[PDB]
Amino acid sequence: DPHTYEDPNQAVLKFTTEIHPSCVTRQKVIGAFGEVYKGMLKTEVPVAIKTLKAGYTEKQRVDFLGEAGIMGQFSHHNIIRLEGVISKYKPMMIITEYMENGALDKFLREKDGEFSVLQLVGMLRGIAAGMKYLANMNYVHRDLAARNILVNSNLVCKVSDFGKIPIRWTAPEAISYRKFTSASDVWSFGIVMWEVMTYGERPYWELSNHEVMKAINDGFRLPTPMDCPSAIYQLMMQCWQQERARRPKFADIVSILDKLI
Amino acid sequence: DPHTYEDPNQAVLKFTTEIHPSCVTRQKVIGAFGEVYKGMLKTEVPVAIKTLKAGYTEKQRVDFLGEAGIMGQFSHHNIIRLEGVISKYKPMMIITEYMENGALDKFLREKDGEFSVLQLVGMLRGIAAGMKYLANMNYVHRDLAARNILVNSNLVCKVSDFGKIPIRWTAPEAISYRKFTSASDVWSFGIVMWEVMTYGERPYWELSNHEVMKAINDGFRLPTPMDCPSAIYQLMMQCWQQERARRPKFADIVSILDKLI
């Protein structure tokens, strides 16, 4: 093994392609850790470009580049594509494919009421296909939420982002015992289904994180969204079983949604 | 014949594909002869990976690789698929397709009472189809038991494992005279039907192997499982005829189960 000894800032680059700075053009800021730009990549394709905020430590630099390193391990229709990274130069950049419709939760809020049930279920199916791929790769995500899904022009949804925890989206056993598995991702997927079917309502509304923690252990579950088919809500309820072994697996979820479509 | 002379450790590789170690990544242990890992194979697909315990003799090595050699001769929907082996390097590995729901007996115990009669009969039908294929290949299994069947997400069951004998599953003539034929596999299949319909009860409960040997020669047969359709139990009873020539053949079993469905 030539990599018995390795610098962590090199280890995280393994599944990435190094891109020369002359190949990349940032054109405008589209989001704001650090900033997100819309740009072009000469390979000319449109891309999203993430940079790291000035003053970062080496640890933050490794964590930043490691995001690209995780993304680069994956190749699936419903997982955001990594074009490459600029790591040898400043500012450092993570270059990914451009997604015209931005984050799923924001998208649904802006297009509220505008999709058919079939289109919404199609989005959920793509997310589920992405998560089945991750689960099969033995990757436990821990932050599955509509804000971490990107949407392109064809409404294809891709998982795009890879102890503070996202309390509203996290399974009870993970909040209580830090027990994160694919089955806790399944719980999160149930929350995402609810975010989708309500067109981007915040899970548990204005309830505080503490009220949510208490509610879910008391057996409270989010109620059916308006106009949500009962089979869709029933699947949500299965994803939110208190006993994680009772939740369906992602392969089961994909099959269930396919039969619905 | 270029293989008049051959080393047994090469003879057992004939129906296998040699896989380069750089193509395989073990990710975690999922069972424990030797160990079983969940892993990835670049060809990227999830796989199960079996290794051989440290300190093995050459005879054990040949037996280990021969398992892969047997599996590799087969190609059927209800027989586990061999991806390949690593034999040229240590540790040696047998790489098979990944089955999400694990061993059938364990699976049924965890999902006790959760399936419809049609789903259970469907599982039995797939197992029977697999055994009909083996029987047609002139392959006598000798260890057909729910523990040797694997289940994937669509509930497809596959025969997956290929002197001390498994006494509770073994036909009387095979226990007494080592007379193993497809008809003694049929007896074992009857036991498997009982394992499935009772959701993973041990055949003959807490009775010892000796009590079982005596019981079956005395004419004792396992009673009908709860909620078992009489036509399913009658088929079990036919599989357990003392005269092996009276048992149905696997082709008969497949046809019988198809008419029920």
Identify whether residues A246 and A190 lie together within a single domain. yes
Cβ–Cβ below 8 Å for A137 and B100: no
- DSSP H helical segments within B102-229, as ranges? 104-110, 117-136, 172-177, 182-197, 209-217
First and final C-alpha spacing in chain A = 49
Name the helix (H) or strand (E) containing B24: strand B24-31
Q: Which residues make beta-bridge pairs with A38?
A: A28, A48
Q: Which residue of A75, A131, A136, A249 to mutate against B (max B Cβ within 10 Å)?
A: A136
Other CB atoms within 10 Å distance of the CB of residue B177: 9
**Preceding peptide of B225 cis, ω within 30°:** no
Token readout for A97 is 């494919």
Of A67, A98, A129, which closes a domain? A98
Residues contacting residue A141 through CB under 8 Å, at least 6 positions apart:
A131, A134, A159, A162, A185, A188
**Cβ contacts of A110-116, under 8 Å, gap ≥ 24:** A111/A199, A112/A199, A112/A200, A113/A199
SS3 A126: helix
Q: Is B258 helix (H, G, I), strand (E, B) or coil?
A: helix
Buried b (16+ CB within 10 A) or exposed e, B94-125: bbbbbbbbebbbebbeebeeebeeeebbbbbb
Chain A partners of B154 at a C-beta cutoff of 8 Å?
Answer: 255
Same domain for B201 and B162: yes
Alpha-carbon distance A131 to A190, whole Å?
Answer: 12
DSSP character string of A150-217: EE-TT--EEE-------GGGS-HHHHHH----HHHHHHHHHHHHHHHHTTSPPTTTT--HHHHHHHHH
Q: Which of B38, B100, B154 sits opposite A138 (nearest CB)?
A: B38
Residue B75 sits at the chain A interface (C-beta within 8 Å):
no
CATH number for the domain spanning B48: value is 3.30.200.20
- How many Å apart are CA B184 and CA B170, to the nearest integer? 7
CA atoms of A224 and A230, how far apart (whole Å): 8
* Whether the Cβ atoms of residue B159 and residue B126 lie closer than 8 Å to each other: no
Can you say whether the dihedral through the CA atoms of A181, A134, B127, B179 is positive or negative?
Answer: negative
Beta-strand relationship, B82-86 and B149-151: unpaired
Residues B63 and B131 in one domain: no
How far is residue A142's CA from residue A113's CA, in Å, rounded to a whole number? 29
Cα–Cα distance list, A3 to A6, A61, A64, A84, A125 (Å): 6, 20, 21, 22, 39
Q: Are strands B45-51 and B93-97 parallel, antiparallel or unpaired?
A: antiparallel
Q: What CA–CA distance (Å, rounded) separates B154 from A253?
A: 11
DSSP A146: G
Instruction: Please name the residues in contact with A121: beta carbons below 8 A apart, sequence gap of 6 or more.
Output: A232, A257, A260, A261
CA B225/CA B222 separation, integer angstroms: 9
Strands annotated E in chain A: 24-31, 36-41, 45-51, 82-86, 93-97, 149-151, 157-159
Q: Which chain A positions have a beta carbon within 8 Å of B110's beta carbon?
A: 245
Q: Is A102 left (phi over 0), alpha (psi -120 to 50) or beta?
A: left
A161 is catalytic: no
Q: Any residues with CB less than 8 A from the CB of A174 and at least 6 apart, and which?
A: A142, A165, A180, A184, A187
Positive or negative, the CA dihedral A48, A54, A56, A58 is: positive
- Cα separation, A176 vs B112, whole angstroms: 28
8 Å CB contact of A75 and B44? yes
Q: What span, in angstroms and rounded, lies between the C-alpha atoms of A252 and A127?
A: 13
A63 shares its domain with A105:
no
Q: Which amino acid is at A16?
A: T
Q: Which residues have CB under 8 Å from A222's CB, separation 6+? A: A191, A194, A203, A204, A236, A240
- Report residue B9 CA to chain centroid gap: 24
Resolution of the experimentally solved model in angstroms = 2.1
Last residue of a domain, one of A98, A124, A144: A98
- Cβ-nearest to A251 among B27, B100, B110: B100
Is the dihedral angle over the CA atoms B118, B120, B121, B123 positive or is it negative?
positive
The pair of three-digit structure tokens given for residue B157, joined into one six-digit string:
């069951």
Q: Are residues B23 and B116 in the same domain?
A: no
CATH number, domain of A135, equals 1.10.510.10
CB-based contact B26:B34 (threshold 8 Å): no
First to last CA, chain B: 49
User: Within this chain, do residues B85 and B127 fall inside the same structural domain, yes or no?
Assistant: no
User: Which of 140-179 (A) contact B at CB < 8 A?
Assistant: none
Q: Alpha-carbon distance B163 to A87, whole Å?
A: 63
Task: For residues A92 and A125, state if they share a domain.
Answer: no
**CA B151 – CA A16 distance, rounded (Å):** 36
CA A210 to chain centre: 24
Query: Rounded CA gap, B2 and A255, in Å?
Result: 50
For residues B130-142, b (16+ Cβ closer than 10 Å) or e, as one string? Answer: bbbbbbeeebebb
Round to whole Å and give the CA distance between B165 and B174: 9
Domain that holds residue A9: 1-98
Residue B93 phi/psi, 5-degree rounding, is -140, 145
Distance of CA A43 to the CA centre of its chain: 26
**Distance of alpha carbon A145 from alpha carbon A103, whole angstroms:** 10
Same domain, B123 and B224: yes
Pairing of strands A36-41, A45-51: antiparallel
Domain end point (choices B78, B98, B118): B98
Tokens read off for B200:
């993973």
Burial of B8 (0-12, 13-18, 19+ CB in 10 A): middle
d(CA B191, CA B207): 15
Bridge-partner residues for A79, per DSSP? A159
The residues after which chain A has a C–N gap greater than 2.5 Å are 32, 43, 162
At residue B150, φ and ψ (nearest 5 deg) are -110, 155
**Residues after which a C–N gap over 2.5 Å breaks chain B:** 32, 43, 162
* B111 lies within 8 A of chain A by CB: no
- Domain shared by A92 and A213, yes or no: no
**Catalytic hit among A63, A143, A161, A252:** A143
Report the distance separating Cα B5 and Cα B17, nearest Å: 21
Cα separation values, A54 from A58, A257, B180, Å: 12, 44, 75
Q: From chain A, pick out residues whose CB is under 8 angstroms from the CB of B27.
A: 138
Cis ω on the peptide bond leading into residue B91 (within 30° of 0)?
yes
Instruction: Report how far apart, in Å, the C-alpha atoms of B54 and of each of A92, A200, A206, B33, B61 are.
Output: 47, 55, 58, 9, 11
Closest CA to A220 of A195, A198, A237, A243: A237
Q: How far is A246 from chain B (nearest CA, A)?
A: 9
CA distance B86 to B63: 14
Which chain B residues touch A245 with a CB distance below 8 Å? 110
The count of structural domains within chain A is 2
User: Which of A192, A172, A191 has the alpha carbon at shortest distance from A180?
Assistant: A172
**Burial profile A5-36: b = 16 or more Cβ within 10 angstroms, e = fewer:** eeeeeeebbeebeebeeeebebeeeeeeebeb
Let me know: does A81 contact A68? Beta carbons within 8 Å: no
Q: A25 and A126: one domain?
A: no
Instruction: Give the technique used to solve this structure.
Output: X-ray
Q: How many residues does chain A have?
A: 261
Candidates B63, B143, B161, B252; catalytic one: B143
Residues B159 and B44 in one domain: no
| Calpha distance B160→B131 (Å, rounded) | 11
| DSSP reduced 3-state for B183 | helix
One-letter amino acid of A260: L
Same domain, B34 and B107: no
